Design a protein around this ligand. Structure first.
Ligand SMILES: Nc1ncnc2c1ncn2[C@@H]1O[C@H](CSCC[C@H](N)C(=O)O)[C@@H](O)[C@H]1O
Ligand SMILES: [Zn+2]
Ligand SMILES: [Zn+2]
Ligand SMILES: [Zn+2]
Lengths: 244, 12
């Protein structure tokens, strides 16, 4: 049961029954909304510059600097290196079973610093849908939580639908960070390495978790500076957790 | 009240 079985629902379901792969969820290539709601100024690379290894819409791209992706109308067209979310230019990753955090993610090759890992895809919810799901997940006695704040009135929920970014565990000393990118006038969240990440190392981010729950989950990241609990010291209200 | 639950906040 390899990484490729995630694209094969019949085989993945079988692997899940044998405990070889995590439980089934729906694999989505972009965010699904339950309730629905410009070009850069880079000089186009010549055929010779492309051949010589020159990057199109690299470090000096006006769109990239502002965390905006380019569209098909980019002056660099096909060569544009600034359409990673759209072109699914995800890093080589593996889903692993951890000792006590459940499933996790790890680098399947060495990843340089500020490398796009994956987009945190899911179902985008409003405050009313978020509160409905809070009750659902609490009534189901769910152990793992998959809510990612997008904007004040938008929560990305990857509990039922998402991608393998839903497997990224918390660390008080992480090797990734989230970045909010504008893709087609819509905001998206992606994970980016903050440092060189050797092959086989678990990919982690700092949740900055806003715990509404009565009880805190203990943190097993193992950092010398570990906060002991996901959520830290304080318990917040559901409305605060939801961004109101 | 939910025994567990919380929201992840994007930060840098
Ligand atoms: N550092 C950590 N310590 C303990 N549990 C962790 C953790 N990081 C993540 N988790 C667990 O993972 C959940 C976030 S979803 C991350 C993927 C998950 N481990 C899975 O098996 O599907 C949390 O609610 C918590 O249960
Ligand atoms: Zn550009
Ligand atoms: Zn471009
Ligand atoms: Zn910790």
């Amino acid at each position: 049961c390899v990484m490729d079985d995630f694209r094969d629902p019949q085989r993945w379901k079988e692997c899940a029954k044998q405990g070889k792969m995590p439980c089934y969820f729906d694999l989505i290539e972009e965010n699904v909304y339950l309730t629905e709601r410009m070009q850069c100024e880079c000089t186009p690379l010549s055929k010779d510059e492309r051949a010589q290894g020159e990057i199109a819409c690299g470090e000096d791209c006006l769109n990239r600097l502002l965390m905006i992706e380019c569209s098909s109308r980019c002056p660099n067209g096909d060569y544009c290196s600034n359409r990673r979310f759209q072109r699914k230019q995800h890093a080589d990753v593996e889903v692993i079973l951890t000792e006590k955090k459940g499933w996790g993610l790890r680098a399947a090759k060495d990843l340089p610093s500020n490398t796009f890992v994956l987009e945190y895809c899911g179902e985008v919810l409003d405050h009313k849908e978020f509160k409905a799901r809070v009750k659902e997940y609490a009534r189901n006695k769910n152990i793992h939580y998959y809510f990612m704040a997008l904007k004040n009135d938008e929560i990305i929920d990857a509990t039922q639908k998402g991608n393998c970014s839903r497997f990224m565990n918390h660390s008080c000393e992480p090797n990734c960070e989230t970045q909010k990118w504008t893709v087609n006038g819509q905001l998206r969240v992606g994970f980016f390495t903050t440092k060189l990440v050797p092959s086989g190392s678990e990919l982690t981010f700092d949740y900055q978790f806003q715990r509404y729950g009565k009880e805190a989950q203990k943190c097993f990241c193992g950092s010398a500076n570990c906060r002991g609990y996901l959520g830290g010291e304080n318990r917040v209200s559901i409305r605060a957790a939801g961004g109101k | 009240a939910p025994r567990f639950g919380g929201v992840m906040r994007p930060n840098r």
